Amino acid sequence: KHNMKAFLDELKAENIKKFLYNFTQIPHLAGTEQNFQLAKQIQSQWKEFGLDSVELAHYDVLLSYPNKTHPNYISIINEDGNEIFNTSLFEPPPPGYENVSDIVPPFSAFSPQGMPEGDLVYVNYARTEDFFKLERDMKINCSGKIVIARYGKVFRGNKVKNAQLAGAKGVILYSDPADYFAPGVKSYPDGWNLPGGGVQRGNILNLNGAGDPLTPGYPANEYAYRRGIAEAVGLPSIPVHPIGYYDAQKLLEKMGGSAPPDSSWRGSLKVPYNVGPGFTGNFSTQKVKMHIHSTNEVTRIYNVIGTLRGAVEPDRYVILGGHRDSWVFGGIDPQSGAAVVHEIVRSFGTLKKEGWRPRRTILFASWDAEEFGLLGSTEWAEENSRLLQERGVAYINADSSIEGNYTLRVDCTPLMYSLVHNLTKELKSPDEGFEGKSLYESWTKKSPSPEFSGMPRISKLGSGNDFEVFFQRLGIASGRARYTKNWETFSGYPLYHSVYETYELVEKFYDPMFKYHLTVAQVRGGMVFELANSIVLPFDCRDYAVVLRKYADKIYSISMKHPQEMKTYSVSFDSLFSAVKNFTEIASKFSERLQDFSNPIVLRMMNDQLMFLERAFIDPLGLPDRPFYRHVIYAPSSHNKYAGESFPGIYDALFDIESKVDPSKAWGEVKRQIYVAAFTVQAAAETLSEVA
Amino acid sequence: KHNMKAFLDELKAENIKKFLYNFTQIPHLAGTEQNFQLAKQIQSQWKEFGLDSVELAHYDVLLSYPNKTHPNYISIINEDGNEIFNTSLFEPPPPGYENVSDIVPPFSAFSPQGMPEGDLVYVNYARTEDFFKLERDMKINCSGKIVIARYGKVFRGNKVKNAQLAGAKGVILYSDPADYFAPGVKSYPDGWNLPGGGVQRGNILNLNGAGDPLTPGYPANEYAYRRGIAEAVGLPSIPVHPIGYYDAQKLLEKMGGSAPPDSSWRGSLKVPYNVGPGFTGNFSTQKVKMHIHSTNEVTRIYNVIGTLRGAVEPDRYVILGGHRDSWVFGGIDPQSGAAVVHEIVRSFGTLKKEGWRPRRTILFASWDAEEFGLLGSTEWAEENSRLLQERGVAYINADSSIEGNYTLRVDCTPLMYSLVHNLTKELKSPDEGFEGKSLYESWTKKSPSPEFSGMPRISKLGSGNDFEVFFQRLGIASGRARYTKNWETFSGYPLYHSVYETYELVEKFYDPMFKYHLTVAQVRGGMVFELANSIVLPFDCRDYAVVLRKYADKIYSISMKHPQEMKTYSVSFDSLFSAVKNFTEIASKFSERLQDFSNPIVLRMMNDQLMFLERAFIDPLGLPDRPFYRHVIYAPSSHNKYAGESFPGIYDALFDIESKVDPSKAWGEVKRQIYVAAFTVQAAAETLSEVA
């Protein structure tokens, strides 16, 4: 038979291993010749594997690169203007790769150029609350200072935005061993920890879903009209540069001014973590000088788009997408994901060659320029938005397959919770101690749900990956899954976006038997298989009703911190609770009808109701000042692009409301956002009502 | 059999006549008890007639009414402040209706209150070009003047916007006999002409598709958050009032200052049509004083929504809608349309009672508050936008069925041209001299197409009626049809929006045998029947390809008035012509496939391609500063809401471009609009490509 089991059995750990090795021998930086060559290889192989059609879709987007003959670096300068200490110009390359060329040195993509010089202020993680503590409590003024901030907790782009709004004239980002060095493990190459010379690359844009900074709304195709740089979306106004903890120690050790306000501000280096501004007595005349010469350049990028045409509903698209561009070798990010996708395509293609086709069309994507702001996925979705709007069933992301070796991690729409439960109960756990047990059992044991005993944690989608345009802009049901660490016993993974992320890191330290990679291929691939093959779409609307009530309870409790204002301004959540109650009731009736209907019009009518349910949460007017975040239930947090926020319009209207100078106007806007959310929930519910 | 012929034969002229008489005995002003009573009567009757469900949908929207105990009027005042002449407080009521109560006196709905006093300037029709001629050529300054303008040529709301931008402190609108008195016909009640005491009512908003001024984006339901009046959409800033030509003569006769610039500025009254400012020598010390005391009030309105559930595709909606609210008796506007809708519902219901059902669902609507800004249709569509987006096949409007007795008038999407041709060839002409001939033959004879011999004129949709939200906001294929006058041998119809629009006007002067009403019922009803019953949707994509080329040629020729700027700024239309060529090619291939496919998935897949083709022209970002006009091919003219403009984004970027102070920036924006139009055309074309 050709069924899910056949698909799943054809997947092989040894193949994922071969593909990972193949994808990680040279850097594949977006916009470079090497990454175009890999795109062409993937296109050829997907054709060989049996897909009906495989095309490149290219765009010309703004990218950013250091100047090869004018390197970026930071100095401490004395009062004579002698640079007495300079940060490193490159990470020491890993063993056996010391002769690879075109390793891009560490830099912050899209930094403007400049050579600002000034006194340092240390701002902890540069979070909104860290700046509140500095300015409101400690009375420290960042205006015209250079801020130094440790990586971790929140997206680096939010750190830069926060520093910029505080009046900083530059930002230095560094990796503290408190966040990137796990106790009892050695530094690369002898373990999976970040060495003192290691540096995390990464873009520092605040795109809010726009895609290419120059063409918001429309694909960056051959005839595109582009904004001028001054009107570009999301570019920072002050220079930024990342360093490792050897260099950070040299910048931090002379810090004077105020002591850190509490221990949550101290990392693991042998320095006091003084906030400043400036250096102690003896060195008070020395300053810090940045030298940034990176340039922004419009550059061609290439997505690979593979099609496996559906046998019955070819006009319904189930999409499996992940990126191909990497900062350097991409051993985990993204090639651990791309190797999994490659094996999934191979397995589907094996079935196709035997005469099988999925019920619905499956689209496979190898996105470019994800590291520069989700540019390749976003431009392609802007190009194809009408097809995606009306035909998109689901999007499953496929970036890094592992960030640890402990248990599964899933973030997805509630419409996929039941699908994920049912699938993981049919898969074998790869974990030691759980041989012969299901993945559901091991995952539920290691990562229990905080709400329900006997069920695993599944999180909201945030952002910082290629599902953003599909989910928060277009309203297509979306999900992602990877293996992860025990969060209960450091930040992401230590070698994230460093030159040390290699094939050897994965094969030696994370997944020597490629069993976690194989399990992740079974989860991502099994989800795509069910979405594209199941007669009735595998979405349960009742799961959305349950989370909508949780989110309503949560946003109500935030508001009820201000009981006197809610009385004065007549702030009522009754409309929202009413809408959520109605959604619960209507979803329950729709589910009965879905169980209780040979009629392919009723089926497809009801499949269309299921498909367009995520779509009903989109507001074509967008959220305030964020027109490409249109989903009313979920947006990336205004304070941390990686984290999801529920009822974001209401959340942001309530945030720090007690500081607003005109409370009537601020509470008016809370009420406006309650109305918009209640209306959108009721409107979504009514899409599940009988159609006539 | 139950086929179109059965439907069409059941329609009766005598029924339309009975319903018109029934709907026009008392005023049905929006927001009044009488109009709520008529809504309840229509709901009961549509149930009786056999519809599956008939509901009221109510909203609380901003309306406007004169103050009963403080009437609006205009004076000429002498230097002592004596009001030496006052305009009338009411139109003389027509014979037999002199005791009807609650006839609203003439007023301009949504005028602010004020008692401005000043010198008059006469501005012809107050069009953009009339203000250009005044200010640029004649050097006449309107700042702080009261402007007097004749009705006609363009929507009155555009006149008020133009006067306001010129700095006027008030606007007087009047009906000139040149535009509202046809030679050789007598005044009501002895003919169909406007008497000297007759006055055209009407709103003066500039909503640009927003709906209720207080709730743009969202339905004005029970928990709606409303803007304050100061932030309301579309309200005028200066007082406005309409008068008849007896009163206008008294205001115009003393006018001095400059002579009219040419004969196109002179109407038919015995006055010189001097532009002013102010009065001649003897009277130069007299002024004009307005007294406006109308109030804006949030008021409940009621739509009637009738459903005839489809047998095969109940989740596909074909909508027949027209309004019910009137200024006074509504003899033509809207009840000549509503009586036609009522008979259409009756006929469909007769078939239903015999066991018939349409293939697709038909929705019937009696909209409220159309006269106050398309409020009832727009609020209901904001409420139901997700259902309409994903399920709306077509919208057929049904306002006034007659504005003359000469020939047919159709404005619609090109997707309906072939449908309208085929239908009118099967209908009998009602015209004298064409007995035994088709409606197509008589219409083609009297109103020949300007492009193709042997075909009738069909116009673009403009606006100023209830299709606006469905077509230009939501992108649902839309059409309208009525009987009209010979435009070749006055403005609209003379008694438009006056107390003299009565049952007797229609029965005595326009359509004594109700044969034009019956033909219009056959056209509107036949279109709804084919849209809701035809196995393949009756849309021909190739007709869009033909008009897109015409519109591209037209917008290119406008730009080519500025050859030197197109060279300097590298302004190319090549991308747009390329997109139109591609649309032509792809539409031709789709048509072949549509002819050449027993498979209901392929059918419904291709019906979905047909349904979503109009939808593909919507840009979710809207046009500049007009977020509710989203259709890229068609918007209401920025200078005249009634007229349609093609490629409106490019048209407005080119308009008066030679006057812009920064030509680089102005031509940049032309290029941006070319890119947006070319992209949207190509994206629409690609929705017709093979789906996988």
Ligand SMILES: *[C@@H]1O[C@H](CO)[C@@H](O[C@@H]2O[C@H](CO)[C@@H](O[C@@H]3O[C@H](CO)[C@@H](O)[C@H](O[C@H]4O[C@H](CO)[C@@H](O)[C@H](O)[C@@H]4O)[C@@H]3O)[C@H](O)[C@H]2NC(C)=O)[C@H](O)[C@H]1NC(C)=O
């Ligand atoms: C969740 O679902 C329920 C449906 O089960 C839905 O109930 C609806 O609530 C609306 C809004 O409250 C009701 O609106 C009323 O409708 C009647 C006519 O049917 C009007 O007379 C009412 O207005 C009068 O009373 C008001 C309230 O005091 C006054 O402000 C007003 O001035 C009038 O005097 C009122 O508009 C509607 O009838 C029900 N529909 C039902 C019960 O079927 C509820 O709205 C849904 N929740 C959300 C968030 O949509």
Ligand SMILES: *[C@@H]1O[C@H](CO)[C@@H](O[C@@H]2O[C@H](CO)[C@@H](O[C@@H]3O[C@H](CO)[C@@H](O)[C@H](O[C@H]4O[C@H](CO)[C@@H](O)[C@H](O)[C@@H]4O)[C@@H]3O)[C@H](O)[C@H]2NC(C)=O)[C@H](O)[C@H]1NC(C)=O
């Ligand atoms: C109408 O339909 C046709 C398809 O039949 C479509 O043609 C496409 O045009 C685009 C845009 O011109 C072509 O883009 C090219 O693609 C190749 C790779 O296939 C690139 O190498 C080309 O770029 C080079 O040359 C450029 C132009 O001089 C340089 O600016 C650039 O720097 C590169 O050197 C170029 O991007 C595309 O191949 C075709 N597709 C075909 C023929 O199948 C046309 O775009 C459609 N019209 C619209 C408005 O969409």
Ligand SMILES: *[C@@H]1O[C@H](CO)[C@@H](O[C@@H]2O[C@H](CO)[C@@H](O[C@@H]3O[C@H](CO)[C@@H](O)[C@H](O)[C@@H]3O)[C@H](O)[C@H]2NC(C)=O)[C@H](O)[C@H]1NC(C)=O
């Ligand atoms: C995840 O798996 C569960 C458990 O298998 C699925 O729920 C089950 O789905 C079936 C199919 O609809 C239900 O069967 C129905 O039972 C009723 C009798 O009560 C009958 O009328 C129907 O004709 C049909 O046989 C079954 O009750 C249900 N079990 C539950 C809800 O506990 C679930 O659908 C899966 N989720 C997916 C696929 O997203």
Ligand SMILES: *[C@@H]1O[C@H](CO)[C@@H](O[C@@H]2O[C@H](CO)[C@@H](O[C@@H]3O[C@H](CO)[C@@H](O)[C@H](O)[C@@H]3O)[C@H](O)[C@H]2NC(C)=O)[C@H](O)[C@H]1NC(C)=O
């Ligand atoms: C308006 O009426 C015209 C004329 O009747 C309709 O066009 C006709 O449509 C039919 C049905 O698709 C075409 O018939 C086809 O002919 C080909 C052979 O060439 C055959 O392969 C198909 O199986 C089918 O029999 C016919 O050619 C066509 N005539 C034309 C285009 O001149 C038109 O569709 C109607 N418009 C509507 C309904 O919107």
Ligand SMILES: [O]C(=O)[C][C][C]([N]C(=O)[N][C]([C][C][C][C][N]C(=O)C1234B567B89%10B%11%12%13B85%14B%1158B%12%11%15B%139%12B%1061B%12%112C5%153B%14874)C([O])=O)C([O])=O
């Ligand atoms: O532009 C854009 O938008 C983005 C791009 C890029 N892209 C990536 O890279 N991407 C990745 C990472 C993220 C993640 C990590 N990170 C984490 O995981 C986390 B976040 B939250 B908290 B925060 B901390 B705890 B929680 B989560 B956890 C930790 B962090 C993944 O997706 O894979 C970046 O970012 O740079």
Ligand SMILES: [O]C(=O)[C][C][C]([N]C(=O)[N][C]([C][C][C][C][N]C(=O)C1234B567B89%10B%11%12%13B85%14B%1158B%12%11%15B%139%12B%1061B%12%112C5%153B%14874)C([O])=O)C([O])=O
């Ligand atoms: O608010 C809005 O938006 C609207 C509302 C209301 N609504 C109506 O009333 N509506 C009607 C009328 C119009 C038409 C008449 N008008 C005409 O027809 C015309 B327009 B254009 B030119 B101008 B002149 B030649 B052409 B067309 B013809 C003449 B006028 C119809 O639709 O029926 C008004 O307007 O007030």
Ligand SMILES: *[C@@H]1O[C@H](CO)[C@@H](O[C@@H]2O[C@H](CO)[C@@H](O)[C@H](O)[C@H]2NC(C)=O)[C@H](O)[C@H]1NC(C)=O
């Ligand atoms: C990764 O694998 C691919 C596929 O085998 C290798 O590309 C092939 O290289 C051989 C020998 O040089 C050629 O004959 C083929 O034309 C290539 N096939 C393609 C590009 O589809 C590629 O060289 C491998 N990369 C590494 C680093 O091992």
Ligand SMILES: *[C@@H]1O[C@H](CO)[C@@H](O[C@@H]2O[C@H](CO)[C@@H](O)[C@H](O)[C@H]2NC(C)=O)[C@H](O)[C@H]1NC(C)=O
């Ligand atoms: C830090 O780097 C700078 C720049 O390369 C070094 O300063 C330069 O030193 C050379 C040779 O001594 C001079 O000719 C240049 O004029 C200097 N440039 C600048 C910008 O000062 C500096 O010596 C380095 N510092 C350390 C400690 O290595």
Ligand SMILES: *[C@@H]1O[C@H](CO)[C@@H](O[C@@H]2O[C@H](CO)[C@@H](O)[C@H](O)[C@H]2NC(C)=O)[C@H](O)[C@H]1NC(C)=O
């Ligand atoms: C218009 O027609 C309707 C429908 O016949 C009339 O309404 C009916 O009036 C009779 C007698 O007063 C009542 O018994 C019915 O209950 C009414 N039916 C309804 C409202 O559905 C209405 O009076 C007529 N109006 C005019 C001016 O003739």
Ligand SMILES: *[C@@H]1O[C@H](CO)[C@@H](O[C@@H]2O[C@H](CO)[C@@H](O)[C@H](O)[C@H]2NC(C)=O)[C@H](O)[C@H]1NC(C)=O
């Ligand atoms: C125009 O109307 C005004 C207002 O009704 C008339 O002026 C009023 O006349 C009465 C009685 O003579 C006075 O007591 C009021 O003080 C006047 N009001 C104002 C605002 O002036 C005026 O007579 C009318 N003019 C004509 C020619 O009829």
Ligand SMILES: *[C@@H]1O[C@H](CO)[C@@H](O)[C@H](O)[C@H]1NC(C)=O
């Ligand atoms: C890189 O280095 C210097 C900076 O002035 C210059 O010679 C060259 O133009 C630069 N390259 C750029 C800016 O791309």
Ligand SMILES: *[C@@H]1O[C@H](CO)[C@@H](O)[C@H](O)[C@H]1NC(C)=O
């Ligand atoms: C901090 O920085 C400078 C001091 O020169 C000043 O202009 C700015 O207003 C200060 N802000 C606060 C909040 O103290």
Ligand SMILES: *[C@@H]1O[C@H](CO)[C@@H](O)[C@H](O)[C@H]1NC(C)=O
């Ligand atoms: C792999 O799993 C082992 C066993 O728990 C653990 O000690 C080790 O830290 C893991 N490696 C990584 C990179 O997480």
Ligand SMILES: *[C@@H]1O[C@H](CO)[C@@H](O)[C@H](O)[C@H]1NC(C)=O
């Ligand atoms: C109508 O007339 C006067 C205007 O001041 C006043 O007595 C009454 O309040 C007015 N009605 C309104 C404003 O609705």
Ligand SMILES: *[C@@H]1O[C@H](CO)[C@@H](O)[C@H](O)[C@H]1NC(C)=O
């Ligand atoms: C016209 O009106 C007043 C004259 O007081 C003046 O303020 C305004 O600027 C004038 N405008 C033009 C264009 O002449």
Ligand SMILES: *[C@@H]1O[C@H](CO)[C@@H](O)[C@H](O)[C@H]1NC(C)=O
């Ligand atoms: C009705 O038609 C006759 C015959 O052409 C014409 O003379 C008359 O003007 C028409 N009536 C109206 C209101 O157009």
